[PDB]
Amino acid sequence: AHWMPGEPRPAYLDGSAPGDFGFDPLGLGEVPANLERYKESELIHCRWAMLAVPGILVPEALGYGNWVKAQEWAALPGGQATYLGNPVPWGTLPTILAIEFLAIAFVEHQRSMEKDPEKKKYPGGAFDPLGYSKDPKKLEELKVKEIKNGRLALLAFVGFCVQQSAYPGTGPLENLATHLADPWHNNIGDIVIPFN
């Protein structure tokens, strides 16, 4: 377990934590309270991004959008979201912002008030149906799996955002389609090396 074999491990990164492959070049997690805050925020970023990747790929495969087309309707005054074709009757810009704020603020601020640093990241109980917590010998494996898939989804979200930045008006499945059609001449190389 090491992000780069041959590099020395930080003394505070032993490998016991889930996904602790010793990757701290800049030295951010040197004090332990900041490291617990960073673990909580890593898992939060991870869970949001890996929930987001289906919400980006699926509505582009079948939902008739491309994950930014789902936002353009709010940029134009007059027009509401096309949740699978049908328009939503819950208003367009301001009231969805009200519901989003009033819902996620309550959820995330009931998350904030937790003091146990393990429940701050792995609460369980109501958030653990199906009883996938009653055996730590596999729960550690599942925590490593969560961390790994979540870091993968975070990198995939960088892929989404930067493929949107390089190609302004497309989506990731269109990028994969272009790479499956002509894989050599339609890759990143035309952007890292701009011809003009």
Partner: protein, 98 residues
């Protein structure tokens, strides 16, 4: 949505966040900062005879401790967000990014 509805809903949803959601955070931050300390002592403790924290206005009854000053604060945020909504909606402005 009529403007009375907008003002009432946004104010209600602001002091609802203040009464139930963002109360313990605001109050624990208040206790953390505590008071303005002039050379260790507070402003009233060092003297000045005018910076005394008023308690006749903050003693109001509530099982959780809501006071009239939080009613003004959550509610100033309320009227502010309401008028932001109202003016932003009444201004037919096209962001026209696309």
């Amino acid at each position: 949505l009529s403007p009375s509805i907008v003002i009432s809903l946004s104010t209600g949803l602001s002091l609802f966040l203040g009464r139930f959601v963002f109360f313990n955070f605001q109050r624990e931050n208040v206790a953390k900062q505590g008071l303005p300390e002039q050379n260790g002592k507070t402003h009233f403790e060092a003297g000045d005879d005018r910076a005394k924290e008023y308690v006749s206005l903050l003693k109001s009854n509530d099982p959780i401790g809501f006071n009239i000053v939080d009613v003004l604060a959550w509610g100033s945020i309320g009227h502010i967000v309401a008028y932001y909504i109202l003016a932003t909606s009444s201004n037919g402005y096209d962001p026209s990014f696309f």
